[PDB]
Amino acid sequence: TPAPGPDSLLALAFPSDPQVSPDGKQVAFVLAQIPRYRSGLWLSEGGAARPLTHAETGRGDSAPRWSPDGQNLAFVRSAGEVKAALMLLPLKGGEARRVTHFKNGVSGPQWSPDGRFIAFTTTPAALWLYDVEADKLREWYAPEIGIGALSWWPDSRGVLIVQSEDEWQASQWRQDVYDLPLPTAAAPQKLLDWNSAAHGLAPHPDGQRFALIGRPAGKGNTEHAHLYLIENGQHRRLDTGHDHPVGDAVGGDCHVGAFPEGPRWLDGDTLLFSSTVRGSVGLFTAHIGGGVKAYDHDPQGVISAFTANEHGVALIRESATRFPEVELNGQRVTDLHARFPFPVREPQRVTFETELGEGEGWVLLPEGEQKVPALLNIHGGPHTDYGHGFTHEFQLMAARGYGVCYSNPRGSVGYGQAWVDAIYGRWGTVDADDLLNFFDRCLEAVPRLDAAKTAVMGGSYGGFMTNWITGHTTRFQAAITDRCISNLISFGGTSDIGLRFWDDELGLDFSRRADALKLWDLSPLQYVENVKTPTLIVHSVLDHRCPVEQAEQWYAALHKHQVPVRFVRFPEENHELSRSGRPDRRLTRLNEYFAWLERWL
Amino acid sequence: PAPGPDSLLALAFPSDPQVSPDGKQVAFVLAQIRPRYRSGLWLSEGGAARPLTHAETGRGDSAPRWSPDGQNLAFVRSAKAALMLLPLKGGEARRVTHFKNGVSGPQWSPDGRFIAFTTTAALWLYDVEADKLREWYAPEIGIGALSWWPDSRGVLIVQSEDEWQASQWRQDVYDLPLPPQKLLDWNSAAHGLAPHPDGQRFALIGRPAGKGNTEHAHLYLIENGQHRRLDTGHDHPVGDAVGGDCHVGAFPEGPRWLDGDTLLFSSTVRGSVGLFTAHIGGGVKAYDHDPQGVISAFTANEHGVALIRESATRFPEVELNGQRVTDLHARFPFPVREPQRVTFETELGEGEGWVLLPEGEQKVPALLNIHGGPHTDYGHGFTHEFQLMAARGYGVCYSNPRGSVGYGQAWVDAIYGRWGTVDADDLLNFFDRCLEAVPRLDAAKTAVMGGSYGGFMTNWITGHTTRFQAAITDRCISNLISFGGTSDIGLRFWDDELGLDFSRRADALKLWDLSPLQYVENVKTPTLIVHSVLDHRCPVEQAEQWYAALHKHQVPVRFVRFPEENHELSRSGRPDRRLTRLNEYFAWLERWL
Amino acid sequence: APGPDSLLALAFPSDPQVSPDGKQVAFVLAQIRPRYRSGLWLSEGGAARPLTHAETGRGDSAPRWSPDGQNLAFVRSKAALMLLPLKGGEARRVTFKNGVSGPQWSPDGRFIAFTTAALWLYDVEADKLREWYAPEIGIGALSWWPDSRGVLIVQSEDEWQASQWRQDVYDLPLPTPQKLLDWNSAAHGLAPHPDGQRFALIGRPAGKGNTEHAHLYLIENGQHRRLDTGHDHPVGDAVGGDCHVGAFPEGPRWLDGDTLLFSSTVRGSVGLFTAHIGGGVKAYDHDPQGVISAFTANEHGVALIRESATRFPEVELNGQRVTDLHARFPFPVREPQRVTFETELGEGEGWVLLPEGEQKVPALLNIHGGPHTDYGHGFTHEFQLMAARGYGVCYSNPRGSVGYGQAWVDAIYGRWGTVDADDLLNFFDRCLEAVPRLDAAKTAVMGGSYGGFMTNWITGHTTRFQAAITDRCISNLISFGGTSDIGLRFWDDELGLDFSRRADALKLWDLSPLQYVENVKTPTLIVHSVLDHRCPVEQAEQWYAALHKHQVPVRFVRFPEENHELSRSGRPDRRLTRLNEYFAWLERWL
């Protein structure tokens, strides 16, 4: 195997959207491949998956959807002149046929269970309806604000949709569920007064009840997302006795494309869903009268996407040492980890003590026995987990001679609601303690880690924490702050989530004098005069979530203090690989990371 | 019907009044007609000026420079930017340079052998007799002011040592002979190099090291590395720092030696700009100073003087040796009205302001306008915006609070380190005296508005009193902390203006206590927010914070985000930004009064 | 009342390719100012289903079955060779800046031959390409030997022989060409015998000009014997019809070692026939009232396209219709009635298509081009549309037509404007007698190419017609000889005259309708393409200028698009505008 560099990424192909066939015997999925990445449809009937489409221009093909009779695949095509067109491909032979002709394209196609219709959105994006037998199209519903989740009733009489009433409620993450019948020209009638976060609609097979993922209106958005059964405007929690959130919230950098996680009824009593547990993501079943049981939970693995019906299940699975692979009914149908171009190593667990119990993290070491630099990596969120996702960046760091230290401080999401709530209103206290305590225990437990060549780095909240830590201790020899936050006041006015984020996470309103002062005392920029650590700053110019003004303030302050500093301003926004298939941003980012580490460690 | 913003399109804008070496002619630039403005050269030998070039594409022609023999005009043409030579006695202009990125700032050598200019920025040199071009000097940081020695042996140049000194606005003067040695240890702000006729000494505009850039810019004679102030007994800054919105293009103000003992310069005095002479042996004398007028640009030699002149009631006109040579005020499409003076008292003496009323006798809404800077003056510049406001039925109230620049150094220093105290007092005190002195002003239909520092002050005032019925904040500042990190002047601006460093904890808290956003919870006044998305001086994050805060408080608010940067009319000739800005101003005032 | 827009309701089939096992048929269908695009369709016995879908360019054409029956090669549009697995999957692009044409699989499935003009060869198993042969002059017909050892190709020696339609047959083995037949004449449609040595061709031996019927000839060691003996009719479809868009294969196919299947034009019809090595011709599928325009065959099955004067072209597989294209015709079709006339060579025939009702209707004499083609039992949308708009359409096969024996063709040799004009006016007079609904006071004459020559000739020799429409006309036979891309050979074959010879040129001038233009009084619409290489526009310019000088009402439509633009690019604008001009002129003068 050759010498690993950032270029190792280009050897990888990225799977997504594992769609099981209605009869449960096949899986169709998306694979992004090589320079620009483009995606095509792949198919497996139990054996090694085979390519079904091959794109040479544009972004490629995505969103495969089986017709209920199992004979056709609907999907979205992005070519040289087409933004995103709905296609129909007969599986028994022939070429795909273009069905829609929109300048701006379409997204999110869903067959009706009877195969008579395909719903999709196009431009707020309006909901359209394709009549399959009549080959006609018609605008179904044009919302004033926009449509969130969508699912057909099992009898194909209409769809349930999630939407807000105004921009203010959407900014506050408050939504309701509506019933929308097929048009006989017709308006949607409200079905549930939720006034809260809701997605992942799972209509019960009885045609009346339905499940959703979210939280009731009473609790803030730091509350674990849970499963709720809805019946005649009432709600009943289904994942009772399960102090863990629904969905995958574990880190990993090999997710390109759509990763469906919609709950699915295996029968009238059983609801299948995914859940994050201590750095892992497993499949579980909820019973219509309550109680969670494990369905497919490896405490050392991550199930990042799944589809299911009464006849089969398809999913994508990964671990800290295994690249994502597609499965059909427990049989791996891809050989994607074999493409990983250098050997992966096994992490070692290192724990630390907190007043709420033992916390955990991991150390990934390189080969050999010599002393190696120690890199403390901090995940964002902050309510996510490090753990058993596959992280090409971490394996590459170890392959280049660095010890990677990454943990789940208080504020992480997989260790119970109380672990999340520990940092509420006081970022920079017990979370910073846990991160520095964890790192100290790494230096003690692993003597190979060189205590004289250490660095701290993280993204988003991890960038906030990198700025906070370097402003409160000079112990680190290098720092890399990515998509950072430095000034909590200006963030509240500039971020597209600034109006609600600090209220949910800290109970503070930047537009209120007393709250603003508290936000300033929580801002790493107040303590910037103490920073002595050479810092690399990475940020997108057009970032709407963490505006680049956050990074500009940190750069200007360090520059004024004559602290060695380097500011990489990307013209591409984050997640550019998924957006256009161009890996340039990821490659340049990794290059800047290692160049900075090489100079100072 | 009442005139609207479209009245702007009736105007033509003069700039760069260049007197000929023999003092008998003046060449200048005129920008005239959304419809787009283009510039061409005009010429007058004493009578009505005539067009000399006619551009139909691009931005047009600029920077006319007389050849020493008086037979040719050099200028810059954008049809990017080419150096042209036009023989004045007959013929067509000839293109001389072939650069992709263009040229800027041409200056003939006094002997007529060379023309110096910059290009990317490197300094280049054109040999006139040889018709050859050649790179003179490629600085690492950049070149500021530039002037030829009188014997054409070389040039004096202003430049900094590093980017940090440039960020701190500290510069030195260098000697660069024909194809550089440090000539003056200045380590401070310097421009307007005016070489003495003796070939050894030279004067400059600026300030010595010690006090920050809030100190009045003055004239300094340099001799063998030593400096002595020349404009003594004159507690006023050099240059035009008076408001006005009919200045499009370049306005030269370089001091000029009328003889071996007399240096001609312009100076701002109590809302006016006049010409003065500083004498090598002696103080300052008035040369051409109307306390009710503004001389915005001038060129001079031993034989003649050319300038641009304006007042609060007179559109800018070009003059040659005291004779008006343009007819530009005649183009103003509606009658202009005369302001009345209203005074207010402070512990530093009497302050002054003005009220411009509409025709008639009925009550009219009262608009308090606040100038930016803050170290500039309102007063006797021509302001089309103010005349248009009065023509549409509004009483315009504009004053010079403490912090303004034309009333002595102490008037400037009163606000140092404490914006939002005595400056805000002076503005509301002045406005109260307006309501008292002018009964036509409607005390129940008032609005407050301003740009840059005036936008900071609009945000500050509405956060400390609900008295105003409407507010318009333009290119505002709302968060002094984030400004320090985002502004292209943020590293030095608060240090000079407030003695505060945003990167230091104790100073940052003081900056937050001076930030209008801390008090935003008190704002009840409907506010229009105007800002350019690409603003580098006042980043748009300043306006985004004010909008989001008012919107969260459910205060009526409107946020106009311009894709065009400020001064787009001078930049590309497109008046769309100014027209749209005025439309948004009046639509908001019509909605709330 | 229906107008020219009715054309846009139609979809046009072409290239019916039977599968090697004879159980399937793949063909091309072009369907919808709106533009026609073509895609591949497939039927295994039932209603055909679409197999490819093109949204840009002209579309897909030339489907060719893999010998194993699992893949389809085809051309996609400049023009790329594609391979589509029929049991599932997507098409793969296989090849060039200038595109491809005429793909043919080797019988063993190891190669695909094509042109791009150089001959190229695609190695299927190796997925490699290689130039096979780059001729100096060009390649004509091409067919693989049954053992896939090489190809037979038709070529001329120089440009002069090519202009004179003189060709030979060459043998080209697979690379790592020798002449096979001293033909020195016209040849195409190579049909290699299954024995790997002999082969048949369509054409004519040297001696008589190209007015001689094309026949079938079996080749053995440089010797030739006519195979379709006792059959005084030419090989191939030479019957008029305006619903043929795309390629219509007519290559003869050996059904066994003794039987060669071929098509032939007989009295306005085209049927399938078999020629036997040991004896005469027998009918295989010949309806005297129908037209088989294209066919492919093997030892296991046959696919074809069939039509009649009252039935739009449909695709068939082993006698079963697999398309429903006639159902798309947007107005009722009417049936023509036969009207005969007498000549010294026997009875001639024509047809009259009337409008609905019983009132008097104008009479439009239409003259087909060629001149050695037939009117009759092809489907003609233009004629049906004319009848739907109130016109009686009269169209016949005068002497010079091709389906009534060699003597019928030879009657006009060297003397256009004599017996052919007589037969046309004799037929038209019999129409007025036999069909009292035809209005003798509201008559018009019209035709294309040779029919335009004849429209010009007739109106220069009689004023009886109230209107005239001359299309792609010929007016000056002298200048035609020098300007036409066939001018060097056409008059020599058709008239025995050489325009570059003084005596012949005078004879050509006496045959030129422009000599007699001073007699024209009939208002004439002139239709011509500016870029026409076969009938240069100078032919129409002379007729327009002459009629205009005589102050005869005249209108000159100059199309920027060449003829057959619908087949060329899929744009029907030329055909729609042409029909609009036709009816506007007829509406003005009746």
Q: Nearest-CA distance from C566 to chain A in Å?
A: 24
Of A81, A93, A98, nearest to C88 by CB-CB distance is A93
- Chain-chain contact of A92 with C88 (C-beta, under 8 angstroms): yes
What strands lie across the sheet with B218-223, from one edge to the other?
A: B190-195, B202-206, B218-223, B226-229
Nearest chain B alpha carbon to A549: B486
**Chain B residues touching chain A at CB-CB below 8 Å:** 479, 481-482, 484-486, 490-491, 501-505, 508-509, 512, 517-521, 539, 541, 544-549, 552-553
A221 burial level (CB within 10 Å; 0-12, 13-18, 19+): middle
Determine contact, residues B195/B147, Cβ cutoff 8 Å.
Answer: yes
Helix B490-498 / helix A549-560 crossing angle, nearest 10 deg: 60
Instruction: Show which residues of C are catalytic.
Output: 449, 564
CA atoms within 13 A on the CB side of A85: 18
CA B126 to chain centre: 31
Residues of chain C contacting residue A93, judged by C-beta atoms under 8 Å apart: 51, 85-88
Using an 8 Å Cβ cutoff, are B321 and B44 in contact? Answer: no
Backbone angles phi, psi at A237, to 5 degrees: -65, 135
* Residue C57: both structure tokens together: 């360019």
- Using a CB-CB cut-off of 8 Å, the residues of chain A touching C49 are 94
In the numeric block, the tokens 């010879």 are attached to: C501
Rounded to whole angstroms, how far apart are CA atoms C238 and C370? 9
> Do the chains contact at B521 and A527, CB–CB below 8 Å?
no
Method: X-ray
C210, C216, C219, C225 alpha-carbon torsion, rounded to 10°: -90
CB C286 within 8 A of CB C272: yes
Tell me the shortest Cα–Cα distance from A282 to chain C, in angstroms: 34
Catalytic entry in B67, B109, B452, B482: B452
Q: DSSP letter for C59, please.
A: B
CB contact under 8 A, C92 and A53: no
Chain A hits for B482, Cβ within 8 Å: 487, 489-490, 549, 553
The string of DSSP codes covering B287-352 is EE--TTEEEEEEEE-SS-EEEEEEETTEEEEEEETTEE----GGG-SS-----EEEEEEETTEEEE
Which chains are adjacent to chain C, needing at least 3 Cβ pairs under 8 Å?
A
CA angle B428, B431, B436 (to 5 degrees): 130
Distances (CA, A) of C333 to C10, C215, C240, C306, C327: 14, 35, 17, 17, 11
Q: How many CB pairs under 8 A join A and B?
A: 98
Measured between alpha carbons, how far is residue B435 from residues A548, B401, B429, B443 in Å? Answer: 45, 17, 10, 7
User: Does C52 contact A94 at a Cβ distance shorter than 8 Å?
Assistant: yes
CA distance B402 to chain A (A): 28
CB pairs under 8 A between A and C: 34
Q: What value does the CA radius of gyration of chain C take, rounded to a whole number of Å? A: 24
Q: Number of helices (H) and strands (E) in chain C: give both, helices first.
A: 11, 36
Amino acid at A261: E
Beta-carbon neighbour count of residue A587 at 10 Å? 18
C71-76 vs C80-85, strand pairing mode: antiparallel
Mutate to test the interface with A, among C82, C90, C92, C93 (most CBs of A within 10 A): C90
Alpha helix (H) residue ranges in A142-237: 167-171
Strand partners, B366: B395, B446
Mutate to test the interface with A, among B488, B501, B541, B555 (most CBs of A within 10 A): B541
SS3 C212: coil
Q: Three-state secondary structure along A37-77?
A: CEEEEEEECCCCCEECCCCCCCCEEEEEEECCCCCEEEEEE
Helix and strand numbers, DSSP H then E, in chain B:
11, 36
Closest Cα partner for B434 from B319, B532, B352?
Answer: B352
Q: Are B and C touching by the rule of 3+ CB pairs within 8 Å?
A: no
Q: Which of A274, A460, A486, A540 is catalytic?
A: A460
Residue of C nearest to A82 (CA): C55
A460 is catalytic: yes
Subunits close to A (at least 3 CB pairs below 8 A): B, C
Say yes or no for a CB contact (<8 Å) between A499 and B553. Answer: no
For residue A554, what is the DSSP state? H
Q: Among all chains, which residue has been given the structure tokens 């790493």?
A: A524
In Å, how far from its chain's centre is CA B384? 16
Q: Shortest CA distance to A477 belongs to which of A507, A499, A455?
A: A455
| A386, A378 contact by CB (below 8 A) | no
Contacts of A168 (CB under 8 A, 6+ apart): none
Give yes or no for a contact between A552 and B486, defined as CB atoms under 8 angstroms apart.
yes
Backbone angles phi, psi at B55, to 5 degrees: -105, 135
Contact B548 A520 (CB under 8 A): no
Contact C515, C477 (CB under 8 A): no
- Judged on CB neighbours under 10 Å (0-12, 13-18, 19+), B194 is buried
Among residues B483, B470, B490, B493, which one has the least CA distance to residue B544? Answer: B483
What is each CA distance from A533 to A449, A553, A559, B590, in whole angstroms? 19, 16, 12, 55
Query: In a 3-state reduction of DSSP, which class is residue B571?
Result: helix
Question: What's the first-to-final CA gap in chain B, in angstroms?
Answer: 19
CB < 8 Å to B505, chain A: 526-529
Q: Do C51 and A95 touch (CB under 8 A)?
A: yes
CA dihedral C423, C429, C435, C439 (to 10 degrees): 130
CB contact under 8 A, A94 and C56: no
**Letter string b/e over residues C134-150, b meaning 16 or more CB atoms within 10 A of that residue's CB:** ebeeebbbbbbbbebeb
Region class of C167: left (phi > 0), else alpha (psi between -120 and 50), else beta = beta
Question: Is the distance from CB of C252 to CB of C189 less than 8 angstroms?
Answer: yes
Q: Strands of A5-157 (E only): list them.
A: 14-20, 27-33, 38-44, 50-51, 60-66, 72-78, 85-90, 97-98, 106-111, 117-122, 126-131, 136-141, 150-152
Is the Cβ pair C51, A97 closer than 8 Å?
A: no
Cβ count within 10 A of residue C510: 11
Give residues with Cβ within 8 angstroms of C109, minimum separation 6: C66, C67, C68, C124
Question: In angstroms, what CA-CA distances link C449 with C241, C371, C452, C572?
Answer: 15, 8, 5, 20
CA distance A183 to chain C (A): 30
Q: For residue A507, give the amino acid letter.
A: G
Nearest-5° angle of CA B474, CA B480, CA B484? 105
Q: Chain A residue closest to B548 (CA)?
A: A493
Q: Is A104 helix (H, G, I), strand (E, B) or coil?
A: coil
**The token pair that represents C120 in the structure block:** 């190229």
Domain that holds residue A565: 348-600
What's the rounded Cα separation, in Å, for the pair C556 and C541? 8
Nearest to A457 by CA among A586, A557, A589, A562: A589
Residues of C with CB under 8 A from a CB of A: 42, 49-53, 55-56, 84-93
- Sequence-distant (6+) residues with CB within 8 A of B105 are B63, B116, B117, B118, B146
- Pinpoint the alpha helices (H) of A415-496: 417-421, 430-445, 461-470, 488-494
Cβ–Cβ < 8 Å for C309, C378: yes
Write out the two tokens for C259. Answer: 């039987």
Task: Please report which helix (H) or strand (E) contains residue B480, including its range.
Answer: helix B480-486
- Spatial CA neighbour of B218 closest among B231, B228, B227: B231
Q: How many CB atoms lie within 10 A of CB A592?
A: 19
Residue of B nearest to A497 (CA): B548
- Nearest to A324, CA basis, from A18, A62, A590: A18
All residues of chain B having their beta carbon less than 8 Å from the beta carbon of residue A511 are: 520-521, 548-549, 552-553
3-state SS assignment for residue B284: strand
Give the C-alpha separation, C8 to C246, whole Å: 16
What's the rounded Cα separation, in Å, for the pair A230 and B319?
83
CA-to-CA dists, residue C306 to A432, C48, C126, C405, angstroms: 84, 16, 40, 23
C446 bridge partner residues: C366, C469
d(CA B94, CA B81): 13
- Torsion of the alpha carbons at A15, A17, A20 and A21, rounded to the nearest 10: -110
Q: Entry resolution in angstroms?
A: 2.3
Q: Provide the shortest C-alpha distance from residue C38 to chain A (in Å).
A: 14
CB distance B549–A493 less than 8 Å?
yes
Instruction: Please calculate the CA angle B415-B421-B425 and round it to the nearest 5 degrees.
Output: 105
